[PDB]
Amino acid sequence: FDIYSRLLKERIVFLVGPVTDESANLVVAQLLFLESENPDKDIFFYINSPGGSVTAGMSIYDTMNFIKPDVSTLCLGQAASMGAFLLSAGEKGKRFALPNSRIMIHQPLIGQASDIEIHARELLKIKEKLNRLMAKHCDRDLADLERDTDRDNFMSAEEAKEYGLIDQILENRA
Amino acid sequence: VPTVFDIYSRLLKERIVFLVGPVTDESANLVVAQLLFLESENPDKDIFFYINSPGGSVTAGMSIYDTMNFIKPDVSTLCLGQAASMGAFLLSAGEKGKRFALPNSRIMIHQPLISGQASDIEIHARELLKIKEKLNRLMAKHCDRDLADLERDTDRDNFMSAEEAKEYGLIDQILENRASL
Amino acid sequence: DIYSRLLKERIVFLVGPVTDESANLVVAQLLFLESENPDKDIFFYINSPGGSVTAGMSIYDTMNFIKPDVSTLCLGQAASMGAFLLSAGEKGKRFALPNSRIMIHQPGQASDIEIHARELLKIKEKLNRLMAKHCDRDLADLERDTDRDNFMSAEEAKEYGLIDQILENRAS
Amino acid sequence: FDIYSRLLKERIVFLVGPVTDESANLVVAQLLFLESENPDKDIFFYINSPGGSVTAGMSIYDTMNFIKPDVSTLCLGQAASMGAFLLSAGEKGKRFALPNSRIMIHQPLISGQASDIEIHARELLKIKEKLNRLMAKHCDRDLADLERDTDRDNFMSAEEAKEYGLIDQILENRA
Amino acid sequence: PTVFDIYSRLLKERIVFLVGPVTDESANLVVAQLLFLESENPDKDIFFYINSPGGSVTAGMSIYDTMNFIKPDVSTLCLGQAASMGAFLLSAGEKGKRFALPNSRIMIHQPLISGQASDIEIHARELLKIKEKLNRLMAKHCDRDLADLERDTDRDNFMSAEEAKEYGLIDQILENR
Amino acid sequence: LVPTVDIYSRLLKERIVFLVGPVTDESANLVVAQLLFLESENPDKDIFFYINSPGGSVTAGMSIYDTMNFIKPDVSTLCLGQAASMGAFLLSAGEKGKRFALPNSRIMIHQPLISGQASDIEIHARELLKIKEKLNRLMAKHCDRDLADLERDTDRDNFMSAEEAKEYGLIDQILENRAS
Amino acid sequence: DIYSRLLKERIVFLVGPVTDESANLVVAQLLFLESENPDKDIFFYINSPGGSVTAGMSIYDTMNFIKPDVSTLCLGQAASMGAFLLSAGEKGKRFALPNSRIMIHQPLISGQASDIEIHARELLKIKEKLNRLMAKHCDRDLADLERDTDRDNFMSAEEAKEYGLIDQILENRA
Amino acid sequence: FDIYSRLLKERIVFLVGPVTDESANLVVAQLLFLESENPDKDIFFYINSPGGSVTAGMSIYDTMNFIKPDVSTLCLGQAASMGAFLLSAGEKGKRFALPNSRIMIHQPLIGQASDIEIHARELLKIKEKLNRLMAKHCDRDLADLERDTDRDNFMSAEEAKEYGLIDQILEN
Amino acid sequence: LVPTVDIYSRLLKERIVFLVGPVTDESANLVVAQLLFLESENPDKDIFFYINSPGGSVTAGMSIYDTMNFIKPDVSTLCLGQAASMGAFLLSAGEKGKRFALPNSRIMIHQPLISGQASDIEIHARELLKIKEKLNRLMAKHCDRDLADLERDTDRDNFMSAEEAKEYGLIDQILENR
Amino acid sequence: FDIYSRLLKERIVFLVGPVTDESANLVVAQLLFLESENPDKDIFFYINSPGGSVTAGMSIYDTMNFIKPDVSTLCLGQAASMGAFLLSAGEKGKRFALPNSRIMIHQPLIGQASDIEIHARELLKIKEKLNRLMAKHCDRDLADLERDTDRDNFMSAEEAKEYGLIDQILENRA
Ligand SMILES: *[B]([O])([O])[C]([C][C]([C])[C])[N]C(=O)[C]([C][C]([C])[C])[N]C(=O)C1=[C][C]=C(O[C])[C]=C1Cl
Ligand SMILES: *[B]([O])([O])[C]([C][C]([C])[C])[N]C(=O)[C]([C][C]([C])[C])[N]C(=O)C1=[C][C]=C(O[C])[C]=C1Cl
Ligand SMILES: *[B]([O])([O])[C]([C][C]([C])[C])[N]C(=O)[C]([C][C]([C])[C])[N]C(=O)C1=[C][C]=C(O[C])[C]=C1Cl
Ligand SMILES: *[B]([O])([O])[C]([C][C]([C])[C])[N]C(=O)[C]([C][C]([C])[C])[N]C(=O)C1=[C][C]=C(O[C])[C]=C1Cl
Ligand SMILES: *[B]([O])([O])[C]([C][C]([C])[C])[N]C(=O)[C]([C][C]([C])[C])[N]C(=O)C1=[C][C]=C(O[C])[C]=C1Cl
Ligand SMILES: *[B]([O])([O])[C]([C][C]([C])[C])[N]C(=O)[C]([C][C]([C])[C])[N]C(=O)C1=[C][C]=C(O[C])[C]=C1Cl
Ligand SMILES: *[B]([O])([O])[C]([C][C]([C])[C])[N]C(=O)[C]([C][C]([C])[C])[N]C(=O)C1=[C][C]=C(O[C])[C]=C1Cl
Ligand SMILES: *[B]([O])([O])[C]([C][C]([C])[C])[N]C(=O)[C]([C][C]([C])[C])[N]C(=O)C1=[C][C]=C(O[C])[C]=C1Cl
Ligand SMILES: *[B]([O])([O])[C]([C][C]([C])[C])[N]C(=O)[C]([C][C]([C])[C])[N]C(=O)C1=[C][C]=C(O[C])[C]=C1Cl
Ligand SMILES: COc1ccc(C(=O)N[C@@H](CC(C)C)C(=O)N[C@@H](CC(C)C)B(O)O)c(Cl)c1
């Protein structure tokens, strides 16, 4: 059993690199597994991601919120964009980041003019929805979210804790 | 893929079928194969089909569609991430009462897209018109509403949250966790 | 050359993609015909499938700015911006050849894309409104008739008010 | 065991996508193993093919009518061009199409010195004349009708193909 | 070669060339010539020499209408080939003054093309309108009934100068002056 | 491809100088040349600088800008089609009272743009910031405005109609024809 | 320019391949010389490997249509369609420099089967027509041309003169 | 049990080639596994790397310092930039290079003016952070790390010993 | 592409030489030609060299430099836009008393940039280094600045404003209007 | 077992083709595991390589001496640049070549002025380092080695032997 096959036996799941349909649904399949083999031990999601497909990241997000085991998120390397979004979305009290991590949040990115308007209102709805869910994960005013995702918002783990995006900083096991 | 059996296969043993990414004859027939396999394994229990797709080829999706229904097993559908175009068509094509979407998933519907002689172009454009009309009709049957709504609403990209699609008739229930049942 | 000669007969050509360079070339010709004589008609010949909006607007505002009455003639095709500039000719002096085709249709961070989509809709309405003026028609009719590609014969573009008359031979 | 090997344990064979030399010879090999395993139970050839190489598909054709077990075809998604041809040649009374399938029959598409061109064109017209023949045999249709109805892309639904004689019956559910 | 270049010298004979695919460039160049020669003298014939595979339909119609608009009769001469739009503009010449050289070939075929279903429909229906209009016009030129053009153009129809002259597509096959 | 009578040469002694498409060292310097030419022929007649540009290099644009302020003629600007970014920086740079625009032109203004070692990227960013502030202040002088208005209004793409660019102070008038 | 000077002396070149444009440039020079003096011969210098059959028949039928006799001279080479145009100069007036190279072969190229049929039939019409015309140029039987164009047939100026292609090989001015 | 698996068995982990998001996570997973096998027996980390991404390197860094086992580091061939960061991050007393392995330290090196200003602030912060951590691994001032890493600073194994970069160089 | 009245010849009639863009062989030689022709046409009048350049090759620039010093006429430099790298070196090489810049022109100076066997590489690096130190030589001369000042101020990009360029010694005055 | 694992059982490690970091480190790994397997058995390093990354070559080199077993090197086909260096690195007394092999030795080959100064100085330091280690492998005067590495110096197996690079040439098993 390959290194990840074993580390999946201590209920450790990883997210490395961008969040694509395939990387996301792989995370999702691993989560579903670890629940079906025990829906009451907590699952540990280690995130090192720059972000990626919002739809792909939402597959994960909704799966975490769906499954019975608590999903403890830990950011190593970087949790930027949807990576930061899935890090903040851990079970409250159970969100973590290594000391030298870095968390980055920002508003989203990227036919007939009719279709331009369609997709534009839709992308602004995505901006809205994400700002609200992030204010939730952080217990902050929606206004705080909108104002703090306008451009690139980089965070030491200290800042993301204070900002409420994570629960604690972990130098080591103690 | 990590081995545990590998992960998609271990979930296969929970009757979990995945469709990830766009619809190609390739992945469409892979999914068709898994569904026929789960019926040859258990022609009675429910097959659980997970959708995270932007759409794709129409006949590729029709092959899956026809694998559904035909098989005695009920194919429950659950969208995660996204299920647009033919993805939404299939999501609405699940066994009635067994079509679902997670809370923050996104469902989009739109008219059929395209990637010689005037005779050939006439022929194939009218073919596309019959296809667009057949799709509108089947979708009106999946959403249990009239047709006119489907033609008006699929003229341009029509996006919907998990709740607008349920009120449309694409799915039947939203699920936050298993308790939501 | 041939085009400088026809120019000396006050005939300006628009051919193909309305771009910055081609539109402003037409603009230089317009100002030079007004220079040489600000009181004789100009004859603007259009076979264009459209192009840049601001390019075409440089032209539009010039045609309306200069003292000469600018007549227009569509040959082959006038599409999008081409159809717009064909509509923009001096009223009573807009023409097309008996087998021309006139065709009208609509045109970073999420903050930026909001800015630009709002801009694009502003442009869409601006064009619908000017176009309705030209044809003397309802903005609500322009909206409906430019929603997808709208192809029109010379007879149809005439009844629609895009053009005044069809020129078969030089018997008006 | 992978998914397709397990499904071969059901005597189920697929042609997915274009008919190439390989993608057709693989099908021929599967039709062979099913005859070795058990030369009397029918094989069920499942067809979702846009058509393509006529030699590659002729291997499958001659193979279908060569082996002893009856071969029952099924159009899912699409049987276009040589797809529609092989679907048409399944063991008679055993040619089926799913209800929302689509079938298309056409004269052959395709894309040196004048003597070369003169050789190759007269090979292609002979092909074009062979294919309408074997189709008129498969559909119990006239040959003239196949000639006409293949001039350009003739599109037919499962019922239209059943009415042409291309398939025998449509299948909705297990029934 | 400078003789002015060669083509301007022959323009001083009212000789206008259409060589190669009918683009927008080339169609408007021919149109500008036609107008220049009517400006120079609106009563001497213009001589339009066509060797083209065809091209853009609307480009070619910019020429087709300029011919019937300018005062000069426009005599057409096929040398080499006049195919598709070439043959059409060739048969568009002033009747009695349409000519071909004896090894010119002439070919007529139906129109060709290389988004949303609603748009694909509009453009396919438009192309059908094109096909039918062009068929009626070719029937007028060749003095044929429309069904005959519909029938004789469904695929590629090649034609010798004898075949062409009979098809009413031209008036004479000129060996020499 | 420019017809002889070439046509822009002819116009050049209507003292009309064109700027079209991007502002580059080459095209900006060509305008720079035309300006000195018109001044030499007559350093007491107005020049009519017509602009249909989406902008470009800022040093290229400053060529035209600082030349505009150095010659003796009044450099009356006009916009047709679009003057965006530095193209809009120059339209507002015309002699006050002589900056105009046609009815359906489009102005747009926004902050700077851009397509090594930390120490080097440090320096390049510092200069880009000096230039954002420089552009903002000079812009603020052109529309007779507060520098803060310009920082606010140029943070992203600010599109303006001719009325809006007028009110903003970029242009002085809107011209529909000769009676205007 | 040198070539306009030479045009003054009624020499029309044909260098490189024979496209629609190069062939039309030659046709236009033919007409300009004829109009300028219809009763003086025109000298047509061919160094060409051949090319577009239709662009070639433009030059062919045009040489035949203008009053002036068109003498043809082969320097370098006249291949496939170049050779055919060489053999088409006014009978008695077709020449080649001593170290010329002539080549003649049947036509070649480098859709639907019904369309393909139509196209092949037309290609064969062209082949037969060209063999008939070439045979008339050469005063040979048609079967002679059929057999001898079946593949690439190479001829020295010598051999081109026997076959019926040219009339005189030209060593020096003597 | 392929060569690298067999060598993993007794707590040998290789970082070979650049520090990417994936090549780093593999070493991180190996460190976690070797701890899950025994948090009390040391882990030998073999480094032949030109460097790589900074995020991916701090992931391994904090994984090194978090887990219970001492992480000893061993440079073979080269440990440049980030490779030399993690080589210094080895448990003090337990950092080694081969005799002819070569070390290099350098300062880091890689929209609108706003976004540029932001990312520039972030990179200057990253540079500062790394210089401080490096000041402490070596016993050296922050001034020493600012000055000495201004450009590519090459080190023999011995000079690196001097610098507090490693502890000992190993012959046989 | 370039209007006749072409305009560049016509400003040459006024002793205006342009350097626009990167210093290449062909552009630097196109400048050398104009300096020689204007010295021949009248060696008793100033030539006006207008620089808007990011810089470029150092030998190509040295040709212009040595030509500025060879001929008799005072070559008066004017920065417009930017005179970066070599362009700045040229601008500073103008006759002392006749070097100017338009007020929003930006100036830049830095050390030489560049973009086989070990022997060959040592060899070429030696030639990059005497080049760096010779450029510092000449620039400290033009600025009436000591050499160390230049060696220090060119280790990385040093952007300067018109006023800053004046204070350095790179130009003499700034021009707003005549 | 693949064939290379089978021969690795016999304690044979190949260096074939270029010396990249990946390839050199795979050879390092095989050396280490053969030591683990048995540190009282010698290792057979089969070199048919043109050279590669000097640093990767050094990674293998510093291994050879450090592990306990004698690392014998055998040049078959060729050993050039870094391959030849590692060949000369075999346990002194155990550096072999095949008869039709050959050896090649030469000098190392391949921003701002300061950085190029730095990298230059470094490259010349690598040069000196390598020359001195060479003189040590072959016991020759350092003068020889640098003067005998100014450009490409080719050697038969015999020439390598008299040079000190290798020790024995081998015809057959006898
Ligand atoms: B992150 O950099 O992954 C960021 C997610 C934020 C909102 C937490 N990503 C996006 O916003 C992405 C950009 C790339 C990283 C993929 N944007 C989209 O995925 C995307 C793409 C296409 C469309 O069309 C509507 C929408 C979106 Cl939202
Ligand atoms: B959707 O993006 O999945 C859409 C199908 C919906 C309406 C259920 N996709 C298509 O319609 C595709 C477009 C590409 C994105 C693949 N269209 C076709 O596959 C197609 C192509 C050609 C013809 O007739 C010639 C019909 C069709 Cl349906
Ligand atoms: B169909 O698209 O499967 C069609 C075959 C039908 C009529 C049963 N395909 C072809 O006819 C192919 C065309 C390409 C799409 C591959 N044609 C040939 O393979 C071909 C090529 C060459 C010749 O003679 C030289 C004959 C043929 Cl049949
Ligand atoms: B011929 O191949 O030039 C043919 C002319 C006659 C005989 C019909 N040309 C065309 O049919 C052209 C196609 C060429 C580009 C190959 N048709 C058009 O250009 C065309 C097609 C479709 C539409 O409507 C979208 C417009 C036009 Cl202009
Ligand atoms: B506009 O997009 O034309 C804008 C001008 C505004 C800000 C007045 N142009 C730019 O911002 C350009 C964009 C690039 C295409 C070059 N930027 C510059 O011109 C520029 C930016 C920064 C620096 O040095 C840091 C030099 C230059 Cl020339
Ligand atoms: B010669 O090699 O140029 C040869 C001329 C004769 C003597 C054989 N050239 C051709 O035959 C050319 C082929 C290429 C050299 C261009 N043939 C054609 O141009 C051609 C081929 C086929 C058709 O029918 C569609 C028309 C034409 Cl014009
Ligand atoms: B070394 O070349 O590996 C070096 C590490 C030290 C000694 C400074 N690497 C970096 O500095 C890397 C640059 C490249 C390797 C890509 N820096 C980054 O990766 C980096 C830089 C800046 C930002 O903020 C935008 C993020 C990152 Cl991840
Ligand atoms: B500047 O970027 O123009 C700079 C000149 C000054 C400020 C130092 N030019 C260069 O550094 C160029 C690099 C290219 C961008 C042209 N360097 C040279 O031209 C050069 C460099 C080194 C040597 O000797 C090895 C000769 C030359 Cl000509
Ligand atoms: B041989 O061609 O393998 C040769 C080895 C000896 C005999 C000199 N290889 C090298 O010299 C290599 C060059 C190429 C193979 C890439 N030198 C280096 O790899 C090298 C050179 C310089 C520096 O410092 C910047 C590092 C490296 Cl790794
Ligand atoms: C960002 O703001 C914008 C948005 C759009 C444009 C623009 O050019 N639109 C153009 C699109 C393309 C030709 C490029 C456009 O719509 N052209 C059409 C004109 C009319 C009838 C709507 B017809 O295709 O020429 C422009 Cl500058 C600026």
Q: What angle do CA B103, B106, B107 make, to 5 degrees?
A: 120
In the numeric block, the tokens 């577009």 are attached to G52
Are residues E177 and G57, on separate chains, in Cβ contact within 8 Å?
no
Q: Which of G22, G48, G58, G80 is catalytic?
A: G80
Is-contact B123 E108, C-beta < 8 A? Answer: no
H18 lines ligand 7 (CB under 6 A): no
Chain I to chain J Cβ contacts (< 8 Å): 49
Q: What is the CATH number of the domain that holds G38?
A: 3.90.226.10
Burial of residue J117 (CB within 10 Å: 0-12, 13-18, 19+) is: middle
Are I129 and I114 in contact by the 8 Å Cβ rule? The answer is no
Residues with Cβ within 8 Å of D68's Cβ and at least 6 positions away in sequence, in order, are D35, D39, D40
User: Which candidate from A2, A22, A62 shows the least CB-CB separation from B20?
Assistant: A22
- Residues J51/J57, Cβ–Cβ less than 8 Å: yes
Cα separation, D138 vs D132, whole angstroms: 10
**Of the bound ligands, which one is closest to the alpha carbon of residue J81?**
9
Q: What angle do CA C83, C87, C91 make, to 5 degrees?
A: 160
Ligand nearest to the CA of J119: 9
What distance lies between CA J62 and its chain's CA centroid? 11
Tokens of J76: 């078959």
Rounded alpha-carbon distances, angstroms, from residue H17 to C22, C163, H57, H165 = 54, 70, 13, 20
Residues 6+ apart with CB under 8 A from A138: A88, A144, A145, A163, A164, A165
CA distance G147 to G159: 16
Q: Please check whether residue G88 is in contact with residue G56, taking contact to mean a CB–CB distance below 8 angstroms.
A: no
User: Exposed, middle or buried, H119 (CB in 10 Å: 0-12/13-18/19+)?
Assistant: middle
Active-site entry in E84, E91, E104, E141: E84
What's the per-residue H, E or C state across F54-77?
Answer: CCECHHHHHHHHHHHHHCCCCEEE
| Shortest CA gap B61–chain A (Å) | 19
**Touching chains G and D? (3+ Cβ pairs < 8 A):** yes
The structure was resolved to a resolution in Å of 2.0
- Cα separation of G43 and D140, whole Å? 69
Q: Which residues of B71-87 are buried (b: 16+ CB within 10 A; e: fewer)?
A: bebbbbbbbbbbbbbbb
For residues C56 and C107, the answer to whether their CB atoms sit within 8 Å is no
- How many H-runs (helices) and E-runs (strands) does chain I carry? 7, 7
Q: G93 by DSSP, 3-state: which?
A: coil
**Token representation of residue I177:** 């209007």
Q: How far apart are CA A130 and CA A145, in angstroms?
A: 9
User: Rg for chain J (alpha carbons), in Å?
Assistant: 16
- Stated as kind and residue range, the H or E segment containing C2 is helix C2-8
Sign of the Cα pseudo-torsion (E4, E10, E13, E18, in order)? negative
Please list every residue in chain C followed by a chain break, i.e. its C lies more than 2.5 Å from the next written N. 107
Q: Pick from C41, C3, C53: which is nearest to C25 by CA?
A: C3
Cα separation, D23 vs D14, in Å, equals 10
**Residue D39 Cα distances to C85, D35, D59, D89, J164, angstroms:** 75, 4, 19, 19, 73
DSSP A82-139: HHHHHHHTSPTT-EEE-TT--EEE-------HHHHHHHHHHHHHHHHHHHHHHHHHHT
Full residue range of the structural domain in which residue I9 is found = 3-178
Q: How many structural domains is chain B composed of? A: 1
Q: Residue D147 in contact with residue D93, Cβ under 8 Å?
A: no
- Nearest CB to G54; choose among E3, E7, E81: E81
C1, C11, C15: best mutation site toward chain E, by most E Cβ within 10 Å?
C15
Does residue F137's CB lie within 6 angstroms of at least one atom of ligand 5?
Answer: no
Give one DSSP letter per residue of chain F, joined into a string. Answer: -PPP--HHHHHTTTTEEEEES-B-HHHHHHHHHHHHHHHHH-TTS-EEEEEEE--B-HHHHHHHHHHHHHSSS-EEEEEEEEEETHHHHHHTTSPTT-----TT-EEEE-------BHHHHHHHHHHHHHHHHHHHHHHHHHTT--HHHHHHHTSS-EEE-HHHHHHHTS-S---SSS--
Sign of CA dihedral H132, H134, H140, H143: negative
Which three-class secondary structure state does DSSP give residue B132? helix
Cβ(B73)–Cβ(B41) below 8 Å: no
Structure tokens at D123: 């090979």
Say yes or no: A32 contacts chain C, CB-CB below 8 A: no
Rg (chain A; Cα; Å): 16
Amino acid at the residue H69: P
Distance E54 CA to ligand 3 centre (A): 28
Distances (CA, A) of D38 to D8, D33, D35: 12, 8, 5
* Residues with a CB atom less than 6 Å from ligand 8: I 55-59, 85-86, 89, 110-114, 124, 127-128, 131, 135
Question: Closest Cα to residue I82, out of I53, I112, I50, I111?
Answer: I53
Contact yes or no, E with C (3+ CB pairs under 8 Å): yes
Sole residue written with tokens 């008393």: I97
| Closest by Cα among G57, G89, G83 to G152 | G83
Q: Give me the residues paired with residue J112 across strands.
A: I113
The CA F165 to ligand 5 mean position distance, Å, reads: 21
CB atoms within 10 A of CB C159: 12
Q: Is E123 among the catalytic positions?
A: no
Is residue F54 within 8 Å of F81, Cβ to Cβ?
Answer: no
The 3-class SS string of C22-78 reads HHHHHHHHHHHHHHHCCCCCEEEEEEECCECHHHHHHHHHHHHHCCCCEEEEEEEEE
Structure tokens at D58: 């002729």
Of F32, G25, H58, the C-alpha closest to E6 is G25
Cα distances from J25 to residues B45, G62, H77, J31, J41, in angstroms, run 53, 76, 9, 10, 21
DSSP state of H109: B
| Structural contact between residues E100 and E106, judged by C-beta atoms closer than 8 angstroms | yes
Rounded Cα gap, residues G6 and J8, in angstroms: 81
Q: How many CA atoms lie within 13 A of I106 on its CB side?
A: 16
Q: Round to whole Å and give the CA distance between A168 and A97.
A: 7
> Helix (H, G, I), strand (E, B), or coil: what is residue G10?
coil
Helix, strand, coil fractions of chain C, as percent rounded to 5? 50, 20, 30
E strands along chain H, which residues? 12-16, 43-49, 71-80, 95-97, 102-105, 153-155, 168-169
Rounded to a whole number of angstroms, the distance between the first and last alpha carbons of chain G is: 29
| The token pair that represents B128 in the structure block | 């596309």
Separation CA H170–CA H96 (nearest Å): 7
- Chain-centre distance of CA B93, in angstroms? 6
Identity of residue J70: D
Element (H, E) at D79: strand D71-80
User: Contact H122/A76, CB-based, under 8 Å?
Assistant: no
Gap between the Cα atoms of G31 and E140, Å rounded: 32
Query: What distance in Å separates the CA atoms of residue H169 and residue B106, rounded to the nearest whole number?
Result: 59
Ligand 8 test: best mutation among I57, I64, I65, I89, most atoms within 8 Å of CB? I57
- DSSP letters spanning E101-158: -TT-EEEE---B---BHHHHHHHHHHHHHHHHHHHHHHHHHTT--HHHHHHHTSS-EE
- Residue G39's φ and ψ, nearest 5 degrees, are -110, 5
Residue G94, SS3?
strand
Paired sense of beta strands G94-96 and G168-169, if any: parallel
Facing residues of J161 across strands? none
Nearest to G61 among E13, E79, E155 (CB): E79
* Rounded Cα–Cα distance for residues G48 and G44 (Å): 12
In the three-class reduction of DSSP (H, G, I as helix; E, B as strand; rest coil), residue E82 is classed as strand
Q: What value, to the nearest 5°, has the Cα angle with vertex E83 and ends E78 and E86?
A: 60
Which residues precede gaps in chain F, with C-N > 2.5 A? Answer: 5, 115
**d(Cα H144, Cα F135) in Å, to the nearest integer?**
39
> Which two structure tokens, joined as six digits, stand for I42?
């009248």
Q: CA H162, CA E158: separation in Å to the nearest integer?
A: 90
How far apart are alpha carbons I67 and I65 in whole angstroms? 5
Task: Tell me the pairing of strands I158-160 and J43-49.
Answer: unpaired
I12 burial class (0-12, 13-18, 19+ CB within 10 angstroms)?
middle
Phi/psi of residue F177, nearest 5 degrees: -155, -155
Angle at F51 between CA F50 and CA F56, to 5 degrees: 150
* E159 close to E138: Cβ distance less than 8 angstroms: no
Taking each helix axis from N to C terminus, what angle separates A54-66 and A21-36, rounded to the nearest 10 degrees?
Answer: 10
Distance of alpha carbon A110 from alpha carbon J107, whole angstroms: 51
Task: Tell me which residue of A92, H111, D174 sits closest to F113, measured CA to CA.
Answer: H111
What is the CB-side half-sphere exposure of residue A39 using CA atoms within 13 A? 10
**Hey, is the C-beta of A112 within 8 angstroms of any chain C C-beta?**
yes
Give yes or no for a contact between J107 and J79, defined as CB atoms under 8 angstroms apart: no
The token duo for C68 is 């000469």
Question: Which DSSP category does E71 fall into?
Answer: S
DSSP string, J82-132: HHHHHHHTSPTT-EEE-TT-EEEE---B--BHHHHHHHHHHHHHHHHHHHH
Q: What angle do CA F88, C20, C115 make, to 5 degrees?
A: 50
Q: What method was applied to determine this entry?
A: X-ray
H or E element in which residue E26 lies: helix E24-40
A160, A157, F125: which is closest to A148 by C-alpha? A160
Contacts of A92 (CB under 8 A, 6+ apart): A167
Rg, C-alpha atoms of chain G: 16
Q: Where are the alpha helices (DSSP H) in G37-156?
A: 53-65, 81-86, 113-138, 142-148
Q: Cα–Cα–Cα angle for I131, I133, I138, nearest 5°?
A: 95
Short-list C76, H51, I90, CA closest to E57: C76
CB pairs under 8 A between F and I: 89
CA angle I142, I147, I151 (to 5 degrees): 105
Quote the CA–CA distance of A162 and G19 in Å, as a whole number.
Answer: 76
Contact flag I159-F72 (C-beta cutoff 8 Å)? no
d(CA F64, CA I52): 11
Nearest CA-CA partner of A89 in A54, A111, A60 = A60
- Reduced to 3 states (helix: H, G, I; strand: E, B; else coil), residue J171 is coil
Longest dimension (CA), chain F: 59
I144 CB within 8 Å of a chain J CB? no
Q: Counting beta carbons within 10 angstroms of the beta carbon of residue G82, is it exposed (0 to 12), middle (13 to 18) or buried (19 or more)?
A: buried
For the record, the structure tokens of D172 come out as 């909705």
CA proximity to G50, closest of G81, G8, G96, G21: G81
Q: Is C15 within 8 Å of E28 when comparing Cβ atoms?
A: yes
Q: What is the chain B residue with the closest CA to D17?
A: B25
For residue H121 and ligand 7, the question of a CB distance below 6 A is answered with no
Cα separation, D63 vs D49, in Å, equals: 17
In the numeric block, which tokens belong to residue A66? 């769906």
Q: What are phi and psi of G140, to 5 degrees?
A: -115, 165
Whole-angstrom distance, CA of residue J121 vs CA of residue J113? 12
Element (H, E) at J4: helix J3-9
Residue from the list H6, H17, H99 with its beta carbon closest to the beta carbon of J22: H17
- C167 interface with E at CB cutoff 8 Å: yes
Residues in chain G: 174
The continuous run of DSSP H or E covering E58 comes out as helix E57-69
Extract the tokens encoding G135.
């045979």
Beta bridge partners of G95: G73, G168
DSSP I66-108: HHHHHSSS-EEEEEEEEEETHHHHHHHHSPTT--EE-TT-EEE
Which ligand is the nearest neighbour of the Cα of D132?
3
Residue B163 burial (CB count, 10 A): 12
Interface contact flag, E120 B114, Cβ < 8 Å? yes
